[PDB]
Amino acid sequence: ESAQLVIHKKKMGKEMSEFDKYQGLADVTFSIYNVTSEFYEQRAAGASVDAAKQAVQSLTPGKPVAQGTTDANGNVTVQLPKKQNGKDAVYTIKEEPKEGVVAATNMVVAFPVYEMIKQADGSYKYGTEELAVVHIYPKN
C-alpha cells in the first residue's frame, strides 16, 4: 500500500555508493506533494509519460502529503501511498530553501517503481517486482 522514499541530500532507485565522495547536508527539509490527479490530467490531455512528469515537476498542490528533514548523514525517509484517488500515485519532491544551500531541482516519483537489473549478457532491463524502498539523490 505504501512505499518508502529515502532522500539523500549531497553537495555535488537503489542506494548508490558512488555518492559517498560527496558530503551529506543535514537539516535540509523536503516537502512531498501529491500530483497524481494533475499527472493523469496531463496524460488525458495527450502528454506522454515523461512530458506529464516534467509538467507536474513544477507543481506543489495543497499541503505536502509528507515532509522530512535530513539527518547528519544528509538523509531522510518519507512514506508515500503507492495509490492516490484510486490510481498509481505521482509525487513532486521539493527541497525547501535554506541559507547557504543550493537547492536541488524538484524531482518527480511515479509509482510503481521497478529497479533496472543487469542481465546475463543482456545489458540492463527492468524487474517484475515493484520496489517498496526507493532511493533518490536530488540534484540541480
Side-chain angles (χ1 to χ4, degrees), residues 66-84 86-98:
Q67 190 180 62
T69 300
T70 61
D71 64 15
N73 296 122
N75 310 323
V76 63
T77 311
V78 291
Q79 182 173 55
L80 304 172
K82 283 163 165 186
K83 303 289 195 182
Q84 291 283 3
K87 285 199 264 195
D88 289 339
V90 186
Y91 296 101
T92 288
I93 300 93
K94 174 177 183 292
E95 186 181 326
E96 295 297 344
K98 185 186 163 70

Side-chain angles (χ1 to χ4, degrees), residues 125-127 130-138:
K125 307 287 182 68
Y126 280 134
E130 315 181 4
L131 287 187
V133 178
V134 179
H135 297 252
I136 64 170
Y137 294 87

Side-chain angles (χ1 to χ4, degrees), residues 2 9 43 46 59 64 78 82 89-90 104 108 115:
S2 286
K9 181 57 193 187
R43 293 287 292 131
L59 300 184
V78 291
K82 283 163 165 186
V90 186
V108 174
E115 160 193 26

Side-chain angles (χ1 to χ4, degrees), residues 14-20 22-49 51-84 86-115:
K14 55 181 69 197
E15 201 210 357
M16 290 176 62
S17 49
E18 297 88 316
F19 298 103
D20 283 350
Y22 311 105
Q23 193 183 351
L25 298 179
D27 286 306
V28 178
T29 294
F30 291 83
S31 300
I32 304 77
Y33 294 88
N34 181 19
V35 291
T36 300
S37 302
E38 293 78 14
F39 172 83
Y40 292 105
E41 282 171 356
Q42 286 279 350
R43 293 287 292 131
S48 87
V49 171
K53 291 175 181 188
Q54 285 191 84
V56 300
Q57 182 164 307
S58 59
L59 300 184
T60 55
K63 291 191 191 67
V65 300
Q67 190 180 62
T69 300
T70 61
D71 64 15
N73 296 122
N75 310 323
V76 63
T77 311
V78 291
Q79 182 173 55
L80 304 172
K82 283 163 165 186
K83 303 289 195 182
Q84 291 283 3
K87 285 199 264 195
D88 289 339
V90 186
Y91 296 101
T92 288
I93 300 93
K94 174 177 183 292
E95 186 181 326
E96 295 297 344
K98 185 186 163 70
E99 171 165 44
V101 172
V102 175
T105 299
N106 291 1
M107 286 190 61
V108 174
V109 173
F111 288 99
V113 172
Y114 304 97
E115 160 193 26

Side-chain angles (χ1 to χ4, degrees), residues 6-10 13-17:
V6 186
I7 303 165
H8 313 258
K9 181 57 193 187
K10 299 278 182 280
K14 55 181 69 197
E15 201 210 357
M16 290 176 62
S17 49

